[PDB]
Amino acid sequence: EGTSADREIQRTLMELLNQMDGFDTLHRVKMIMATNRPDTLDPALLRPGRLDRKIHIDLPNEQARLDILKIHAGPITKHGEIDYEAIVKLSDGFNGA
Amino acid sequence: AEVKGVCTEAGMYALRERRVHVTQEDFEMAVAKVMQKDSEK
Amino acid sequence: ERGYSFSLTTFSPSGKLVQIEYALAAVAGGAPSVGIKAANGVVLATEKKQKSILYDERSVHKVEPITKHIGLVYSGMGPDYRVLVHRARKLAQQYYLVYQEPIPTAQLVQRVASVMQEYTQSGGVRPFGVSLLICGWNEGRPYLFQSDPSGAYFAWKATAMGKNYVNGKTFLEKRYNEDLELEDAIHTAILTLKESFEGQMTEDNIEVGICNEAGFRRLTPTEVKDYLAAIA
Amino acid sequence: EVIELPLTNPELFQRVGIIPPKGCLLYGPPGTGKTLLARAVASQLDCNF
Amino acid sequence: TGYDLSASTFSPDGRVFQVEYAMKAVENSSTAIGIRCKDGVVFGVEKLVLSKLYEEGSNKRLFNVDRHVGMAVAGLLADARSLADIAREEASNFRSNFGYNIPLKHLADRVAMYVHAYTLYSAVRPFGCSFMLGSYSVNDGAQLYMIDPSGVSYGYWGCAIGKARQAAKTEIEKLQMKEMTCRDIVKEVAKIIYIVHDEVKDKAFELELSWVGELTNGRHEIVPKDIREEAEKYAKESLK
Amino acid sequence: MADGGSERADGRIVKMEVDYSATVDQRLPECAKLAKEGRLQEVIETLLSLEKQTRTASDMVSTSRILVAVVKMCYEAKEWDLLNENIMLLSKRRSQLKQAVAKMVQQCCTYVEEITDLPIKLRLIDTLRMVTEGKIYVEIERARLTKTLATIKEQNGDVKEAASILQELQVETYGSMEKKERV
Amino acid sequence: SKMNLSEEVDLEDYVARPDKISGADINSICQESGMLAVRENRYIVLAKDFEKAYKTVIKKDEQEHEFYK
Amino acid sequence: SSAGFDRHITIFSPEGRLYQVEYAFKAINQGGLTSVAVRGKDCAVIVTQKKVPDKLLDSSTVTHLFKITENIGCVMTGMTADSRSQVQRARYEAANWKYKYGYEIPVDMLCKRIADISQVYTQNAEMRPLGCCMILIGIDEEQGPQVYKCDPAGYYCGFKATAAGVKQTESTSFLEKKVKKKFDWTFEQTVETAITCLSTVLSIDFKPSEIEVGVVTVENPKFRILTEAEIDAHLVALAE
Amino acid sequence: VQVKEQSILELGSLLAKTGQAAELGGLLKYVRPFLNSISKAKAARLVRSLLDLFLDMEAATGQEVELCLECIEWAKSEKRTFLRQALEARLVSLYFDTKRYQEALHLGSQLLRELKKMDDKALLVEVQLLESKTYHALSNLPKARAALTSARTTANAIYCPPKLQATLDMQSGIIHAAEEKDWKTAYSYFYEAFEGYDSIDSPKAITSLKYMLLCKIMLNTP
């Protein structure tokens, strides 16, 4: 019981669902999709045969945090002695950004 | 309505054996299947 | 501290108590249970299933003996059963102290029903969320009874309670009679409880208790494993 | 494992007797490095994109 | 809406909101710092003067729970005095019942349980205070403990409660308290007080210091006037 | 972790030659843990291949209590299933599994080994179970051929030899053997 | 019936599990097991491949608070 | 799915479920710690992780293991003050049973009584149902080792291997896969499996200074806590 | 106690494996005074496990009918309705293999009334099929046809006849071919019986294959 000017997006959606894994088989074509909240996706789009693999990219670990720090803190014109252990311990639940 | 359904489905049993007339065995099979298969849902 | 002291159950404009209906709908989603009485004693059967293999199946019991000749099973919520069991035992002990005679099943059922009723009218208290099956054998004739969150109680001959109980009642309609034995009663109880079991019926997934003119007792795992044979 | 090996050496899966998948999706909390990984894959592969 | 009007309701995410609001109320105190030395504990509080009318030494924030126990307060004042009274009563009862001075590991637990008793029911409200207990004993050493409105009590080596807690603990970290005796640590407490609370926030302030340890021979009391004056004299050189 | 450790192995090779077999207990892991390490592309490979192949000398060369003669253990059991093929966490494969026991160091020996029947069948069976995987398949087949030709040559039970050979070969799909050999 | 499944694979184990898998993810189980066997540079699929693939594909936690009943 | 105040207090919703208990199960995971309990042939072990974010804190008073009685051991998960109150209650009940009936209280009766106490909160509507977990281990004659679990909903059960915390599901699956093999367990094997389950779930390869291990066995039923040297020895023996 | 029961089961299995029939009958007759000393369930399961194995071993026609009758008598004395109903079904199946006319008919008629009123319906379709078979074997087409019709009509309410489906299809095909109305239907029924009876029970698949080949021969399609 949705509104008008909104069923057109649904029309495009089922057109896309038919284009991939439809009556005609695809060959040598691969697709990649990205989203940071997959709750709202249609149950038909997540079905195996259309999006075969689900990949999770969680928050970094202590070793991952140290790796990212070493990657990004490199080029700066540093001086003196640096200790990454305290920085790794303090930064909890962070991101690369 | 299910009386009409039984009547209209008994002929399918005659068709399934490539016949031209309907006998009461088809009626009994039809009524049994219709009454049993309506138990679910 | 202090409570609320105002009733949480009130009459709807259509003259219905909503909380009782909600409690019954919560009871109806519990584990299945069956009870049968045939001419020599009473049999209570229930289906228990652990989520995984880490659980110990010899730690908690669904069937509890109130005294030497009364047994009781439940269907509904888990924790709400234990307090009722304790209260029933206390009431039985009180009666034994007063009259020096074992309490009849009807008196215990009446007292438990009165407690369950009294627990839905006081201030700031929700009703119980379980239903009970009680079995006994006093003065020659056996007895089977069923309680109700609203406090009502009835006397039955064959009862199925819990999830998918209408089909169980239909099955018991076409098999039960008034002339059988304890063993055939156990067999038909297991057969009707098999209507909702999983792919396999292991001895660890069934609890069976029997009460005859010698006293209520819960069957050992070996006996239940044997009984499961020669069936299905 | 999805987009590189099957597009160059496709007789292995035929030898085993399966068909490689087609698509995949990446999810997680914001700012964990999804679009960056996609950019790296697109910038380090010789194929139409 | 309506999940944060009572202390007896769980939000869908699974946390009580009223205690969070109490912590937010606590977060508007001035500052209180406590550091344990080799042979005792030292407290330091910076107090804001609202106007010249108030007499020197009013609104004391440094109580005396027992003959050997101190106390430092941040948050509302009424709840702080109530907690001080209940702690005094409990310590007196323990001394009278058994016969010897109550250790800290027991008094802190009793007070924490009393505080936690209020965050369960809907007929009361959570407290709005966070406090610190300190003491020294010959057979037990120096003891410091911190308790918050939620009812969580921990031991510490050095703590700061109030508005600029982080800006104070980041300077406590550079200090090395594990060795040096607390005869000169008052200087460090004064210096760490004067390096906070920029003059834009408020015009002026005063300092309050406590003392307990082997130097005072168990008893907790205010620092002498001359020692405090020398402490400010040394701490005033932050302008360099 | 290449030369220097191998220097050690070449130092203690004389000890292996002079002393007895149980000393292998102290030389099996010293390279094996090095195969665990695998930090560099070519060192770990040289050390593992050298150690695994070198166990061949003790086998067969020290025929007593070894595969050539009295293979009660040694290569038949101790160093076949357990050497690396079954498990050593992860065995590097590539040079170490191809150039080692799986290839010439044992296949060549089998050609020039027992000459007798009785344990030649058991040596064949053991060296056939290890290679039932993949991306080797130009060593299992030859041994299968050897077994069938031997069995036909003497006992002449054609039914069984034909049966065994038939299922073995699916060489249209092998994809690595040269055409004039697969034909 | 098309892939290898050499000799020691038991399929009656995986059929016995509950949780109502559809018809388009059993193919996913077989495909994932085949891919996993491909990764190990081997052209024969074993039982561990099915075990790992089945554990990976289904991914249902509990949603079954035990004091229902 | 709601009608009235079923979202705010403990009353039945139209579907037959009450949410105020399901919210405590989510409130359990607020701490962010995981604990495991394993049962052996003649012993029982508990392993838990502990984290100290900063060096200012005193690391000797952040334990999550408590000793109710000289023969019974315990571990908590979830909120802190609630766990402390529950431990106090358990100690009181054990002492009362010992005084009244003349012999040591079995672990299963203690767990049953704790669950009975905790079931009232979900019956009356003027109180919050103490969202924290409970794991108990002990030794008992004629049965050997026993491990029991209790959750805030008023429910308890005996186990052979248990995990509680944020990573409950993965550790439970790992323990199930390990126990399906049906291999006889000894002291070293039980400790090694308990450590490796947590190690593979968290993927940390931790040092001997961030775990707590408690053990009981049939040679001296006294509950004891392992020191750091023994933990280091077990860790170095685990990694070949 | 349990050692005696385990030894009895092992001895029965060994006698069945060896290839002797008199020993099984002797053990069955000897273990009568021992049965009334154990639990009811154990005795019932022991009687079942001996009798079914002895009956399903092979055809030594001299020691089966009387044993089944005495088992029926014991079950009726012990008041075990389901056990005696199953044994009655087995006995009426046995009477057909001994080529008896009326003793295999009135027993089925008696059993049908009791089976109809109770839950069991699969046993009912089995008994109906047996009655159709015995009327067919006595050269009476209409009665066998009526019994087969009743069995088919009452077999549509069962959730699944996992193996009785093949037997029912085979009997329907045989009856249809007996009246030589149309051979395509008989061939289809025989093919369905062969398909649904394949790889489960070897002994009776070859006969279905043979009948299907005969039908295809009769269509002048060699």
Ligand SMILES: Nc1ncnc2c1ncn2[C@@H]1O[C@H](COP(=O)(O)OP(=O)(O)OP(=O)(O)O)[C@@H](O)[C@H]1O
């Ligand atoms: N693993 C990583 N290593 C280095 N930088 C990283 C990493 N993960 C994230 N980043 C940082 O993330 C920044 C941008 O992240 P990106 O665009 O990939 O966001 P995202 O995870 O796709 O989030 P969203 O699209 O939901 O906003 C990059 O500039 C980079 O510095």
Ligand SMILES: [Mg+2]
């Ligand atoms: Mg992005």
